[PDB]
């Protein structure tokens, strides 16, 4: 409350920590279905059902344009990712499989970047 601070860890290293991982992400064989932004135009649904799109190149450029503000906002946006990948596609789904395989690689990276 009104001073009484809480220790807080280091988080100068979050914003480039953030990027190696979302690199990683990026790289990983199975994130072509979060590469791009799904085209509103071409998929039948998409716009109605997912009330918030996102992808991987709209969290790098927010991530590059300091539109997050600490490292959970960061997390928020890759889980929705992996939530809408759910949400729009069957679990016995090329891309449904490989939303369960991003979402896995991506919070043990997590866990083992930041939860020391
Ligand atoms: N087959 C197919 C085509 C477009 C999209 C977008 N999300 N899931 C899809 C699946």
């Given at each position: 409350?009104?001073?009484?601070?809480?220790?807080?860890?280091?988080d100068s290293k979050?914003?480039?920590?953030?990027?190696?991982?979302?690199?990683?992400?990026?790289?990983?064989?199975?994130?072509?279905?979060?590469?791009?932004?799904?085209?509103?135009?071409?998929?039948?649904?998409?716009?109605?059902?997912?009330?918030?799109?996102?992808?991987?190149?709209?969290?790098?450029?927010?991530?590059?344009?300091?539109?997050?503000?600490?490292?959970?906002?960061?997390?928020?946006?890759?889980?929705?990712?992996?939530?809408?990948?759910?949400?729009?596609?069957?679990?016995?789904?090329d891309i449904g499989?490989?939303?369960?395989?991003?979402?896995?690689?991506?919070?043990?990276?997590?866990?083992?970047?930041?939860?020391?």
């Amino acid at each position: 409350s009104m001073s009484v601070k809480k220790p807080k860890r280091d988080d100068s290293k979050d914003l480039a920590l953030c990027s190696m991982i979302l690199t990683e992400m990026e790289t990983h064989e199975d994130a072509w279905p979060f590469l791009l932004p799904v085209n509103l135009k071409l998929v039948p649904g998409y716009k109605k059902v997912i009330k918030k799109p996102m992808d991987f190149s709209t969290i790098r450029e927010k991530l590059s344009s300091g539109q997050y503000p600490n490292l959970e906002t960061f997390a928020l946006d890759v889980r929705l990712v992996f939530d809408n990948c759910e949400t729009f596609n069957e679990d016995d789904s090329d891309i449904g499989r490989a939303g369960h395989n991003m979402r896995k690689y991506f919070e043990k990276k997590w866990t083992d970047t930041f939860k020391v």
